């Protein structure tokens, strides 16, 4: 395999990213990241106490955190102002250079306009961004032009397990966007990963799917394999479907 993204010295090789804010067991996190083949570790702060996600203190003891690229996220924030604040706390406190940028309201859905506003601000101070958006061509071009390193694009609602709601729109967007696109949101199983990759996705971000599989570890292993199968399939130029 080859890296699908490079930001400075940091290489992203694993085609599955794994969000970890829902686990309450440090050994399980260690084991899921292992099974998924993850090389990205996702870190944040929770000013409003929305969850009780594990302390880096407790994770650092039991995981080889130096083997991962560290990225920040602002996904607990519920205002644009609060996301920017969290992004700048992650910079100052941990030296985070790479941010998984999330601006959602109380509906747990990316706010495209507000996200673009936050990206202009953070790019202006040299932060490297992976912003989350709904699949809007205009929005995706603005962020590309602002120098975002990759886009995250919503397949379906968070924790819905519905897979990819509007695949054609995601295909159309990936075709027009030069930078890598990560599909994320609502991914329920390995078949959804392979579907994401056959639309041209560079990678996939899963979260709830691993937390809520009967066997998190096996699903992690399955999605790792689905990502590579998905990629190969895409590159092989699959047959066009013969419809009406």
């Amino acid at each position: 395999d080859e890296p699908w993204l490079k930001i400075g010295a940091r290489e992203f090789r694993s085609r599955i990213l794994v969000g970890i804010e829902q686990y309450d067991s440090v050994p399980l996190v260690r084991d899921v990241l292992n099974a998924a083949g993850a090389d990205v570790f996702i870190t944040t702060v929770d000013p409003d106490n929305r969850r009780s996600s594990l302390l880096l203190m407790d994770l650092a003891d039991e995981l080889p955190l130096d083997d991962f690229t560290w990225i920040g996220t602002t996904s607990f924030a519920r205002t644009k102002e609060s996301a920017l604040r969290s992004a700048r706390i992650l910079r100052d406190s941990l030296g985070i250079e790479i941010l998984k940028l999330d601006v959602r309201g109380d509906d747990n859905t990316p706010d495209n306009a507000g996200t673009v506003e936050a990206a202009r601000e953070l790019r202006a101070e040299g932060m490297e961004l992976l912003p989350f958006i709904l699949p809007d061509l205009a929005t995706a071009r603005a962020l590309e032009e602002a120098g975002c390193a990759a886009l995250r694009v919503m397949a379906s609602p968070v924790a819905s397990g519905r897979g990819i709601a509007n695949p054609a729109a995601i295909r159309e967007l990936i075709e027009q966007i030069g930078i890598p696109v990560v599909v994320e949101g609502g991914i329920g199983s390995a078949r959804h990963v392979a579907e994401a990759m056959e639309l041209g996705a560079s990678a996939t971000l899963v979260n709830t799917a691993l937390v809520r599989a009967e066997s998190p570890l096996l699903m992690a292993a399955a999605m790792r394999q689905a990502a590579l199968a998905g990629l190969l399939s895409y590159e092989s130029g699959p047959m066009p479907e013969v419809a009406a």
Binding site: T44, V45, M57, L94
Partner: protein
Amino acid sequence: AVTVSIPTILRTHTGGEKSVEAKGATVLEIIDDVESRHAGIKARLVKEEKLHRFINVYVNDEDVRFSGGLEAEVKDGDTLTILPAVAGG
């Protein structure tokens, strides 16, 4: 007094209360004063005479690292927030 905000994950040590009262002039005095009531918490906050690298402390929303660390000034009526680095989604 100085009203101190505890994050959910550490409320184990403060008998499950999301806030405590305290007295002190530096950050470190405010910590010691809370330890005296609620044993165990200070261990989570400092390591080798320094704030834990994975812990952040604010005085009325100002990060204390830019202002003295453990030795940063605390007035009476100030709010002191503890904000640990956590696993993100």
